[PDB]
């Protein structure tokens, strides 16, 4: 059971991070565009 | 030990974002403070 909870929260957090990281990829390239 | 290193994952993980979006939030704040 314990392993189950650890596992599930792992998958959720990688979901979260991937979305957040794509978003700021977009934001940083936007910052660079307004730089140029 | 199956716990010990599986559990050893999250703390670096939760440390990753916490450092990560900091500048990413700081920069987009610094996007907002001086652009719009």
């Amino acid at each position, epitope marked *: 059971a314990k392993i189950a909870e650890l596992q*599930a929260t792992i998958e959720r957090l990688t979901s979260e991070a991937a979305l957040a990281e794509g978003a700021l990829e977009a934001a940083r390239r936007d910052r660079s565009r307004l730089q140029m | 030990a199956k716990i010990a290193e599986l559990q050893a994952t999250i703390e670096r993980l939760t*440390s990753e974002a916490a450092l990560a979006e*900091g500048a990413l939030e700081a920069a987009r704040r610094d996007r907002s403070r001086l652009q719009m």
Partner: nanobody, 99 residues
Framework: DSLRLSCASS????????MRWYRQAPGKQRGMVAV???????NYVDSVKGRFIISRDSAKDTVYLQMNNLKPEDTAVYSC?????????WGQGTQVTVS
């Protein structure tokens, strides 16, 4: 400031998954502030080192977080926000002046 924060769950007490704090300057996108997990790991969002700190008991899952002699610009809605039992969950969020 000179105030206390008290963040609990009505259930799922202390099954301490990853669980987080949030804030948002209005008209914008809400985000990360502070997070504690199965270990109460000592990390938050960079803008904290020395200003926002965790402190927990499972009393009613009423985890706390330390918000003293503040920094103003945070003036916005704050919200602890926890993710439990394979699913995320969201609190109310309260308008808050800090300055």
């Amino acid at each position: 400031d000179s105030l206390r924060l008290s963040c609990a769950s009505s259930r799922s007490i202390d099954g301490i998954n990853i669980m987080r704090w949030y804030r948002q300057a209005p008209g914008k996108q809400r985000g990360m502030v502070a997070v504690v997990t199965g270990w109460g790991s000592t990390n938050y969002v960079d803008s904290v080192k020395g200003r926002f700190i965790i402190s927990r008991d499972s009393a009613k899952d009423t985890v706390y977080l330390q918000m003293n002699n503040l920094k103003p610009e945070d003036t916005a809605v704050y919200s602890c926000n926890a993710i439990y039992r394979g699913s995320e969950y969201w609190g109310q969020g309260t308008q808050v002046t800090v300055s």
